Description:
Blueprint: H1 8-11, H2 16-28, H3 35-47, E1 52-56, H4 59-69, E2 77-81, H5 86-94, E3 98-102, E4 123-126, H6 138-147, E5 151-155, E6 163-164, E7 167-168, E8 175-179, E9 193-197, H7 200-209, E10 214-216, E11 219-220, H8 231-240, H9 244-261, E12 269-270, E13 278-279, E14 285-289, H10 292-301, H11 331-339, E15 340-343, H12 351-366
Parallel strand pairs: 2-3, 2-4, 4-5, 5-8
Antiparallel strand pairs: 1-9, 6-7, 6-13, 8-9, 10-11, 12-14, 14-15
Helix pairs in contact: 2-8, 3-8, 4-5
Bound molecules: 4'-deoxy-4'-aminopyridoxal-5'-phosphate and sodium ion (3 copies).
Amino acid sequence: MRVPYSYLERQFADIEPYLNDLREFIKTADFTLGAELEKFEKRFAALHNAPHAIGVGTGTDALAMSFKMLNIGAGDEVITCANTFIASVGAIVQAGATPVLVDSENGYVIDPEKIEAAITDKTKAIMPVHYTGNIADMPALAKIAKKHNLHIVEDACQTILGRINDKFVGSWGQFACFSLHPLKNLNVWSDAGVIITHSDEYAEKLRLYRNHGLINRDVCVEYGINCRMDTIQAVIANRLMNQLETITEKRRGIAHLYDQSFVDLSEFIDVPVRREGVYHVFHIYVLRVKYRDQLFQYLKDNGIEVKIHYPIAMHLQPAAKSLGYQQGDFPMAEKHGEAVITLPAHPYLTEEEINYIIKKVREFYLEKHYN
Ligand SMILES: Cc1ncc(COP(=O)(O)O)c(CN)c1O
Ligand code: NA
Ligand code: NA
Ligand code: NA
């Protein structure tokens, strides 16, 4: 059996309804900041019980633009996690700020107990990453931010529908930033980002900033950039998001089945603790395992498209050299690169495929293929 990591071919196999939507959309020629984009934004904001969503060019830009709104840039420090995707740190640098790294904890998110030690006179914000779809410990982070007068920007680019009990992501930061770039639980056919905020003023400012600072075709009130989400992609999003809630819950269901299927293999497989009240959206299903390289080769040889997210931690990337960190600074993020593997875990998998993955993972260890 070959079990694909990507579900895109399956997800968009029933293609005609999308093409039909496009056929009608093209007649309107409403390509730029059009009605469909506003429709999308209102639905997306509502999903997170927030008053405003602003569609922008990419998730990375969403983060950088959030820092711009907060006047965070040259000479400022932004604390984030050493265990994350490059764009998290890239966005800080794009804004002109200096990224400062803190280790992760049991569930791949920023360790709240390690944040204060990293605070300096230059710190202006904390940027927790809701990494793998897990939600950072926001009440703890909010407490720290309040104590030190710091802004929070939530990197939710893997975390549409993320929530802790009564509070959706976006409840704590001035901004929460998301991505619709495939793959995501809600993905369009290109790059796209979204900023949500509860601030009327910041929402208005962002709508100017994403569109050259133009308040109308004749007047630019303040220099801005060209960074808006495409109206035509909002067409795609508006159809797919009809399935967003079901996609996300089914993905959680698969993750739970995996958690249960490996519970007796704690000698070989470390399943992260699932924190109470935390609606982990399982963007990816990541385990820490023994003999990781060997397991990876084995599963691949058996047709399962496993991946590693990611082998080289932020502080060990060539781009990060000038930050001055060294191997040993971030033990959790370092062990992560050595130990993690990601299993295909998307809701377009068949029951047979999911069972096959479980069988092969167990078999590797039970039959001692590591020897
Ligand atoms: C944690 C994280 N933050 C930011 C981004 C950047 O998002 P985008 O690809 O839309 O720029 C990504 C990638 N989607 C991400 O995984
Ligand atoms: Na935590
Ligand atoms: Na996804
Ligand atoms: Na496009």
